[PDB]
Chains A and B, each alone.
Chain A
Amino acid sequence: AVAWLVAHVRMLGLDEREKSLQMIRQLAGPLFSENTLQFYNERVVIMNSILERMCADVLQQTATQIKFPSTGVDTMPYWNLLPPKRPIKEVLTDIFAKVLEKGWVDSRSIHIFDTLLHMGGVYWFCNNLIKELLKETRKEHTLRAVELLYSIFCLDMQQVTLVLLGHILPGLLTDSSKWHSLMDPPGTALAKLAVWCALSSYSSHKGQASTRQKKRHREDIEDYNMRDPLNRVLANLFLLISSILGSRTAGPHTQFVQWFMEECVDCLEQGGRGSVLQFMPFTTVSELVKVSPKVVLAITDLSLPLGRQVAAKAIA
């Protein structure tokens, strides 16, 4: 009945005969009239009512209300909760603003954020995130904001973080217009967020979520060992970091990548593997040390003759 009501919702909806059928189904018809040899219909009726209630929400909203066959205490609180006649420019004013002054992730709005994320696009999502982040202009609140953001950014860590980085870091280093933003300590907080999500993603991760398993079918080449999307994005960002380390103009971004390299220091880390076949990481670490022992030691993977070069260079 529910499946065919949904199918008729997929129709012109001008007859609404299935609506009357569902209404009859939710009515008091089977009130132990016939010889129901169940002896447990009481609980069975409760299960049937709650099952009818959980689905067909589009019918339960777009049509007349049911005759309340649940007779419970409180229905599912988690729902759309999105004001229809209002734009999307409220996620920061209703959630991000409050949670900044708050001390937790506001579990209630977690579902709302999940719906917003699996509804819109990660690009503008992270764009508005970093936009709202670039508003405190004070170290403590920026730190609190980025800490809580890393947490609320979970349940989609790997792919969302990869796309976020590969879009915002080039989208900021590419021109000088966006250099205006990264000049603030919010830039350092963002760098910390970046290295944190990168190190978490590179490590083993299961990432089994409701709105992630059913929405894990995409395609991306990134236009940038092995051929892995995460590894490709890591190499791309490393190459862009080395490029940004270039000369002829440097106000904010050398300090930004300095903060990046500093926060990159971490035990049990394996990023910047730097394959020794035809890869840039060698000259990249050379120029980075040519800007103290963090990168000098990271490049020293296995004391290979390749690493001996950067060792001699860092010896100075």
Chain B
Amino acid sequence: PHWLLGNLVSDFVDTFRPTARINSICGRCSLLPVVNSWKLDPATLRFPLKGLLPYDKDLFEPQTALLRYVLEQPYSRDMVCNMLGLNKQHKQRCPVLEDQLVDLVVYAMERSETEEKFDDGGTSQLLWQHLSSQLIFFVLFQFASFPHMVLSLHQKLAGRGLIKGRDHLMWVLLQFISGSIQKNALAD
């Protein structure tokens, strides 16, 4: 705020913050019980509604953790389409979701690159394949600025994550290019 202005506005926001604190709800842990007008539904990377002065950015930063948790579970396509999407065929706008999906794919690759689940010690590969399938079925805005995938790969290249993930990376890329072969062109 204005330099030549006093700390009056600061102390006013201070004495007003307990109001919004009393009006706060929770830490937004997790809300994904449904399997199908609704709770926990943000419009554009922002859940809060009131224009008050709440506490620190813990509720100002988008709830990336929530979408992160819900995306890994199958059948979430309809859920995320209802909670964030609208007119999937008449409202193509390519929202900020590209960063979310890039981070999810990076996490998936890292979990796959990390000893390959102790050399196929468990069934993490199954969850990885399911998440990849969901992302491929959600190929409507994925190649919005397609170089996003290259940027995510460059970011995952740190720490030399090409030990064992490479096979899974090629596999998920094959899945995606098969789901979008006749649709897009080779230019992208």
Residues of A within 8 A of B (CB): 101, 136, 138-141, 183, 185, 188, 251-252
- Alpha-carbon gap, A108 to B11, bound state (A): 34
Given A251-B3, A251-B4, A252-B3, A141:B56 Cβ within 8 A: yes
Query: CB distance A140 to B3 under 8 Å?
Result: no
6 further A-B pairs in the complex, CB-CB below 8 A; given A136-B56, A138-B10, A188-B7: A101-B56, A139-B11, A139-B14, A140-B14, A140-B17, A185-B10
Question: What are 19 sample pairs from A and B whose C-beta atoms fall under 8 A apart?
Answer: A101-B56, A101-B58, A138-B10, A138-B13, A138-B17, A138-B56, A139-B7, A139-B10, A139-B13, A139-B14, A140-B14, A140-B17, A183-B3, A185-B7, A185-B10, A188-B7, A251-B3, A251-B4, A252-B3
- Alpha-carbon gap, A57 to B17, bound state (A): 50
Residue numbers in A under 8 Å from B58 (CB-CB): 101
Number of interface residues of B (CB under 8 A): 10
User: Would you call the interface of chain A mostly helix, strand, loop, or mixed?
Assistant: helix
Query: CB distance B3 to A138 under 8 Å?
Result: no
Residue numbers in B under 8 Å from A185 (CB-CB): 7, 10
User: Would you call the interface of chain B mostly helix, strand, loop, or mixed?
Assistant: helix
Closest Cβ of chain B to A162, distance in Å, is 28
Residue numbers in B under 8 Å from A251 (CB-CB): 3-4
- Looking at A136, A139, A141, which has the most chain B CB atoms within 10 Å of its CB? A139
Residue numbers in A under 8 Å from B10 (CB-CB): 138-139, 185
User: What 6 A-B pairs come out closest when comparing CB atoms?
Assistant: A183-B3, A139-B14, A185-B10, A251-B3, A139-B10, A185-B7
Residue numbers in A under 8 Å from B4 (CB-CB): 251
Residue numbers in A under 8 Å from B7 (CB-CB): 139, 185, 188
B1-39 interface mask toward A, CB cutoff 8 Å, 1 = contact, 0 = none?
001100100110110010000000000000000000000
Closest Cβ of chain A to B180, distance in Å, is 37
Closest Cβ of chain A to B114, distance in Å, is 16
Residue numbers in A under 8 Å from B14 (CB-CB): 138-140
- Alpha-carbon gap, A67 to B93, bound state (A): 62
- Alpha-carbon gap, A183 to B6, bound state (A): 10
Closest Cβ of chain B to A136, distance in Å, is 7
- Alpha-carbon gap, A178 to B11, bound state (A): 24
Residue numbers in A under 8 Å from B11 (CB-CB): 139
Closest Cβ of chain B to A289, distance in Å, is 21
**Of residues 120 to 148 in B, which have CB atoms within 8 Å of A's CB atoms?**
none
- Alpha-carbon gap, A252 to B3, bound state (A): 7
